[PDB]
From Swiss-Prot, chain A:
Site (Impaired recognition by ATXR5 and ATXR6): T7
Modified residues (N6,N6,N6-trimethyllysine): K3
Post-translational modification: Can be acetylated to form H3K9ac, H3K14ac, H3K18ac and H3K23ac. H3K9ac could compete with H3K9me and prevent gene silencing. H3K9acK14ac molecules are 30-fold less abundant than H3K9ac or H3K14ac. Very low level of H3K9meK14ac. H3K14 is specifically acetylated by HAG1 and deacetylated by HDA6. H3K9ac is deacetylated by HDT1. H3K9ac is restricted to euchromatin. H3K18ac, but not H3K9ac, is cell-cycle dependent and linked to replication. Reduced H4R3me2s increases H3K14ac in the FLC chromatin and activates or maintains its transcription. Mono-, di- or trimethylated to form mainly H3K4me1/2/3, H3K9me1/2/3 and H3K36me1/2/3. Very low monomethylation at H3K18me1 or H3K23me1. H3K4me1/2/3, H3K9me3, H3K27me3 and H3K36me1/2/3 are typical marks for euchromatin, whereas heterochromatic chromocenters are enriched in H3K9me1/2 and H3K27me1/2. H3K27me3 is largely restricted to the transcribed regions of single genes and not associated with low-nucleosome density regions. SUVR1 to SUVR5, ASHH1 to ASHH3 and ASHR1 to ASHR3 methylate H3, with ASHH2 methylating specifically H3K4 and H3K36.
Gene encoding the protein: HTR4
Family: Belongs to the histone H3 family.
Protein name (Swiss-Prot/TrEMBL): Histone H3.3
Location of Phosphoserine modifications: S4
Subunit structure: The nucleosome is a histone octamer containing two molecules each of H2A, H2B, H3 and H4 assembled in one H3-H4 heterotetramer and two H2A-H2B heterodimers. The octamer wraps approximately 147 bp of DNA. The H3K9meK27me dimethylated N-terminal tail of histone H3 can directly interact with the chromodomains of CMT3 and/or LHP1. Interacts with AHL27. Binds to HIRA.
Annotated positions of the N6-methyllysine modification: K3
Residues modified as N6,N6-dimethyllysine: K3
Superkingdom in the source lineage: Eukaryota
Site (Not N6-acetylated): K3
Organism encoding this protein: Arabidopsis thaliana
Localization in the cell: Nucleus; Chromosome; Nucleus, Nucleolus
Functional summary from the UniProt entry: Variant histone H3 which replaces conventional H3 in a wide range of nucleosomes in active genes. Constitutes the predominant form of histone H3 in non-dividing cells and is incorporated into chromatin independently of DNA synthesis. Deposited at sites of nucleosomal displacement throughout transcribed genes, suggesting that it represents an epigenetic imprint of transcriptionally active chromatin. Nucleosomes wrap and compact DNA into chromatin, limiting DNA accessibility to the cellular machineries which require DNA as a template.
UniProtKB/Swiss-Prot annotation, chain B:
Tissue specificity remark: Mainly expressed in meristematic tissues of vegetative, inflorescence and floral organs, like in developing ovules, petals, root pericycle, petiole and petiole side of developing leaf blade or vascular tissue.
Official protein name in the record: Chromo domain-containing protein LHP1
Quaternary assembly: Homodimer. Interacts with CYP71. Interacts with histone H3 and CMT3. Interacts with SUVH. Component of the PRC1-like complex, at least composed of RING1A, RING1B and LHP1. Binds to POL2A. Interacts with DUF7/AIP1. Binds to LIF2 in the nucleus on a common set of chromatin regions. Interacts with PDP3, MSI4/FVE and MSI5. Component of the PRC2 (polycomb repressive complex 2) complex which regulates histone methylation on histone H3K27. Interacts with EOL1.
Transmembrane segments: none
Gene name as annotated: LHP1
Comment block on domains: The chromo domain specifically binds to dimethylated H3 'Lys-9' while the chromo shadow domain is required for dimerization.
Recorded phenotype for the gene knockout or disruption: Dwarf plants with early flowering and inflorescences termination with floral structures in both long days and short days. Phenotypes of the lhp1-3 mutant are enhanced by the disruption of EOL1, thus leading to reduced plant size, early flowering in all photoperiod conditions and altered leaf morphology, associated with an increased expression of H3K27me3-positive genes.
Every Chromo domain range: 8-58
Organism ancestry: Eukaryota, Viridiplantae, Streptophyta, Embryophyta, Tracheophyta
Subcellular location: Nucleus
Residues of the full protein shown: 101 to 158 of 445
Signal peptide residues on this chain, from the entry's feature table: none
Amino acid sequence: ARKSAPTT
Amino acid sequence: PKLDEGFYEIEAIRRKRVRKGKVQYLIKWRGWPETANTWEPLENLQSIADVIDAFEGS
């Protein structure tokens, strides 16, 4: 699976 | 919508929502803390190959 990087 | 460069394993599907017309799932990631949970659309969680193999094996 792929993951979304968190908001910065 | 920028992806983490890595590949990761779903531990659990925790919740569902609709954002901007797209369903997303709250994912607990295997080997990562609860504070690392993320909301993901289906395409990030499931490849076309996954779907086909799952179908052909059923």
